[PDB]
Every structure is written in C-alpha cells, then in structure tokens.
Ligand binder design. Structure first.
Ligand SMILES: N#Cc1cncc(COc2cc(OCc3cccc(-c4ccc5c(c4)OCCO5)c3C(F)F)ccc2CNCCO)c1
Lengths: 115, 117
C-alpha cells in the first residue's frame, strides 16, 4: 500500500534561520518523474507545485517567494524536502505535503517560530 | 493540464434535506478505476476515501457514517458526486475534494446551511 511518511510532526525553529521540513515516499528502484506529483500548501497558500518534473514560480504565494524550494537532490532518495530559508514569524502553522506516485497520500506538519 | 472543476463553489442547502456537491475531473472515455483516487474532507474530517473502485470505510470518520455516499454511477461521466444526507448545521463549512487520475488537483466548496422557521 502507498503511504507518505513524516520523520518530524513538529518543528521548533528561530527567526531568520533555515529549516527543512521532510516527507518520505516509497521509491522502488529509479524515480519515474512521469508519475511524481508533490504539493506543499499551508492554509491553502501554494508553496510548491511540482507536477511531472515541471514547476512554475508564478503560482507560488507572495509570502513564500524566493525563500522556499523543494530539494530535487533528495527526491530520488524518496524525500520531498521542502527547505525554507530566512524564516519569518508569519511562516508558522499547519503545512500539508501531498505526494502522488501511483497512489496518493498526505501528512500535516506543525511549525512554531521563536523571537 | 489536469484540472478539477466545480460547477458551483457555494451551496445554500436546507436543514434536514440532502445535498449533492460535485467535483468534475477529465475522463478520456476510460473507467481506469485502479488509477482513480477520490478523497473528500471537511475541517480535517475524512468523509470519503475511494480507491481501487471501493470506498475505504475504516479511515472514514464515523460522524459521516451511514450518511455520506460517493455516487459511483456518476464517476464514468468524470464526476465525484459527494451526497451527504440529513443535513445539519455542523455540515456547514469548507469541503475539499482531492482527485488523483494520472494527474492531481483539489478544489474547495463552501456550504451554508439555512433553517427557515
Ligand atoms: N487555494 C487554492 C487552490 C486552488 N486550485 C487548485 C489548487 C491546487 O493546485 C494543484 C495541485 C496539484 O497537486 C495536488 C496533489 C498532489 C499530490 C497528491 C494529491 C492527493 C490526491 C488525492 C489524495 C491524496 C493526495 O492523499 C490521500 C487522499 O487522496 C494532490 C491533491 F489532489 F490532493 C497539482 C496541480 C495544481 C494546479 N491546479 C490546476 C488548475 O486548477 C489550490
């Protein structure tokens, strides 16, 4: 059965720091981009939309522009790593990570910032 | 590009009636049930989780037990029709439908419940 896995449900982090929220999905041998969809939202704000290898900066929410990046390096290891840099207080909430890979699941991640 | 469609984004529904909120997705004349996933939530509550031509009931939230039905009849027309029956004020809110069908999208639908005296 297809199932998205989350190592850490809560992220405690600082203002101005860099965090990498992670989501594991089952990669068999070699990653078929033609089946892979990854989508991170937070409160219905589009943070990453990767569909079959294709992403568009224009569809990213204003809040998250130029700061927030899916790490492609990690995807062949079965890991949608969302990396935000220069973290702000307005970033903080329930992030949702949705993977499709011949089968679909999501998981929620809470993020608290300090200072 | 794969695109889930919503005929109406608001529904005004009577108390004690039945509502059928609809999400349209593109079918290229094919059933292909093993690639179709449909999921409705509302306020983090799982309402339907349809997969391999079968509604998975253990993951479904029991506040929606015996009252939420996905209309399977409608799916070959490219239409996840969620039918809730015996509509209450708690059923007002933002429903989210997630379709995966070689291509993935979601849409929100608002439901306002009215009870004339
Ligand atoms: N504000 C807002 C808002 C408004 N409109 C659309 C969107 C989201 O735009 C997109 C989202 C995309 O990928 C989402 C995605 C990716 C991977 C898996 C799933 C998925 C599906 C089923 C599931 C599941 C997960 O987990 C288990 C249950 O069954 C999903 C989702 F369907 F749930 C891909 C493309 C678009 C672009 N939009 C096309 C034009 O309209 C957001």
């Amino acid at each position: 059965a297809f199932t998205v896995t989350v190592p850490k449900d809560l992220y405690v982090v600082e203002y101005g720091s860099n965090m990498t929220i992670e989501c594991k999905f089952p990669v068999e041998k070699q990653l078929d981009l033609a089946a892979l969809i990854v989508y991170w939202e937070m409160e219905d704000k589009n943070i990453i939309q990767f569909v079959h290898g294709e992403e568009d900066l224009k569809v990213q929410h204003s809040s998250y522009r130029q700061r927030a990046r899916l790490l492609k390096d990690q995807l062949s290891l079965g890991n949608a790593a969302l990396q935000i840099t220069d973290v702000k207080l307005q970033d903080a909430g329930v992030y949702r990570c949705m993977i499709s890979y011949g089968g679909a699941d999501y998981k929620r991640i809470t993020v608290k910032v300090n200072a």
